[PDB]
Design an enzyme around this catalytic site. Structure first.
Site, PDB file in Angstrom:
ATOM      1  CB  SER A   1       6.215 -15.498   5.008  1.00  0.00           C
ATOM      2  OG  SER A   1       5.055 -15.173   4.265  1.00  0.00           O
TER       3      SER A   1
ATOM      4  CE1 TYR B   1       3.698 -20.113   5.748  1.00  0.00           C
ATOM      5  CE2 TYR B   1       2.725 -17.947   5.406  1.00  0.00           C
ATOM      6  CZ  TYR B   1       3.749 -18.848   5.219  1.00  0.00           C
ATOM      7  OH  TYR B   1       4.836 -18.397   4.502  1.00  0.00           O
TER       8      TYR B   1
ATOM      9  CE  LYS C   1       7.566 -17.773   7.586  1.00  0.00           C
ATOM     10  NZ  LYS C   1       8.539 -18.763   7.016  1.00  0.00           N
TER      11      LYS C   1
END
Ligand SMILES: C[C@]12CC[C@@H]3c4ccc(O)cc4CC[C@H]3[C@@H]1C[C@H](CCCCCCCCC(=O)OC[C@H]1O[C@@H](n3cnc4c(N)ncnc43)[C@H](O)[C@@H]1O)[C@@H]2O
Ligand SMILES: C[C@]12CC[C@@H]3c4ccc(O)cc4CC[C@H]3[C@@H]1C[C@H](CCCCCCCCC(=O)OC[C@H]1O[C@@H](n3cnc4c(N)ncnc43)[C@H](O)[C@@H]1O)[C@@H]2O
Lengths: 285, 285
Positions: free
Chosen positions: B142, B155, B159
């Site tokens: 991402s 998150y 990532k």
């Protein structure tokens, strides 16, 4: 009063040196809660504290296992000042070896300690800082959080995770008056654990001979990098102090600029090919 | 024969679309093991498969929960070809919200799924690839793995962790003939879970009103970013195909160059101040 500092992972290395550096600061401006996963490892901390003549009460050890939110909360409750001006998230684990040779638990543990543990610290202490509109959070980072190192896949994953964690938080915390900084360390001279890795035998038994050979090469390379670039923990600890004293601390402080060039190479090429090729050559000749 | 592809997280979004894109490839060059955490979610995958007229046997679903090494191993054993040419580590969790409002388990889960889960996949499938001297590993990355996003601390941590994980592996895997690539996705149009986050009420109950306000701002910002930049999963899935077809795949493939500028800003300033300031302004006006 004094600047209340709570540091995780003070049993050795950076955390130990930082704790005593702060506690022994000539100005006596710091009150340090040197927290350790296991209080049985606080000996070197007290030996170092005494060596630096840390005034009585300048340094207090608390058990604080960052894998355990209860431990985090219990340590937080032990901060008699009822505030932490400087939170130093330094607790960490290393994990070196062929990815396939790493135990699943070991991998999980590295993320749990390095990343989730830091999250736990931040969840426990950030709220009060945000409420006060003040507080410094220093997170021990690594150049391995900025660029991938073969055989440190999980370690780097965790350090990179800290980058994402802290950067994400930093974007939010900007207007809160809460300063989060990563202290990006290179190799540091610290003789502490990590030797739970696995003997050559066990490693070779969990990987192929070529990977094992490369692992040796990496180890030889790493030894050279440490022999040539490892910084004393005192120099590194001082970077934390520098970050602490900065009125407008940046998100990152580098303990060395030695790796900036290799690092620059990563953004010069977002495909990552340049870095991968350069680092492969750097590590494996 | 055919290129055997095993993809994790095929219940929706990228994984689903990639699985069916590959399985329905006109050349019929791919044999896809579309693996899902829970086989009860395979309906959309079969609906999509049928919509694309995936030939019978081009697509097979396996249960594969990347949190469970036993599940990983069981799925690997189900690869009848006895080899995986293309391993797509796409299983992932999102986690959005004020760090202090995130459940500890939720945080752990994100790292476990996104990072440890990918490690488990790599531990399970890399050895055979290294042994064969061939294999492509595509990891859904991402832009949030490349730059921190407020309220996506964990998150992004996960990532970013994948970046460190894959980059570290890539340095090693270079001479093995095993190609690891991250498919750096921006916002993708995918209506799937993640709504386990927490209602505004529960979020507000776990954070301060200012953070909550910023969270709203971020959400509003994120909605705008998706409204303006979200890519169709088909376009994103095609980037995986592109990475797969590349004779010398790079470590990273971007599904969009939209965020390269913001990204360039991170290396332009290693202190991270430029990015933090720019992103704060970008998100919060
Ligand atoms: C990546 C690197 C910079 C770049 C270097 C480089 C650069 C270029 C190149 O070509 C090659 C290399 C190879 C070496 C690389 C270096 C390896 C160095 C990192 C080595 C791995 C270090 C492992 C030590 C992990 C421990 C570490 O960081 O320990 C800190 C404290 O954490 C406490 N601690 C542990 N678990 C705990 C818990 N659960 N609760 C509380 N405290 C805990 C502990 O007990 C301790 O006191 C450095 O970061
Ligand atoms: C960061 C970002 C790019 C940059 C964007 C940006 C850029 C600039 C800016 O100023 C603002 C923003 C805000 C939005 C940002 C975007 C948010 C997007 C990410 C949003 C969070 C996505 C959350 C979805 C997480 C799920 C996801 O990725 O699911 C993939 C598959 O994983 C399976 N799955 C789940 N658990 C599993 C398991 N245990 N075993 C196996 N499979 C599993 C699932 O069931 C599923 O099928 C994108 O990456």
């Amino acid at each position: 009063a004094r600047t209340v500092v709570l540091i995780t992972g003070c049993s050795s290395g950076i955390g130990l040196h930082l704790a005593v550096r702060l506690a022994s600061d000539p100005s006596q401006s710091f009150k340090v809660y040197a927290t350790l996963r296991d209080l049985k490892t606080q000996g070197r901390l007290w030996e170092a504290a005494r060596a630096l003549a840390c005034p009585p009460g300048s340094l207090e050890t608390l058990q604080l296992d960052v894998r355990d939110s209860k431990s985090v909360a219990a340590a937080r409750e032990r901060v008699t000042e009822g505030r932490v001006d400087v939170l130093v998230c330094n607790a960490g684990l290393g994990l070196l070896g062929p990815l396939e040779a790493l135990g699943e638990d070991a991998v999980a543990s590295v993320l749990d300690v390095n990343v989730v543990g830091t999250v736990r610290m931040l969840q426990a202490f950030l709220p009060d800082m945000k409420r006060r509109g003040s507080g410094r959070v220093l997170v021990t980072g690594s150049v391995g959080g900025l660029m991938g190192l073969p055989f440190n896949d999980v370690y780097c994953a965790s350090k990179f995770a800290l980058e994402g964690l802290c950067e994400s938080l930093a974007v939010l915390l900007l207007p809160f008056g809460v300063h989060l900084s990563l202290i990006e360390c290179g190799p540091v001279h610290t003789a502490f654990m990590e030797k739970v890795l696995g003997s050559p035998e066990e490693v070779l038994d969990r990987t192929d001979i070529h990977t094992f050979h490369r692992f040796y090469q990496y180890l030889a390379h790493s030894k050279q990098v440490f022999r040539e670039a490892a910084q004393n923990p005192e120099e590194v600890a001082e970077v934390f102090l520098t970050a602490l004293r900065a009125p407008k601390p940046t998100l990152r402080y580098f303990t060395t600029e030695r790796f900036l060039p290799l690092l620059r190479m990563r953004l010069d090429d977002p495909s990552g090919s340049n870095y991968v090729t350069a680092m492969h050559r750097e590590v494996f000749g």
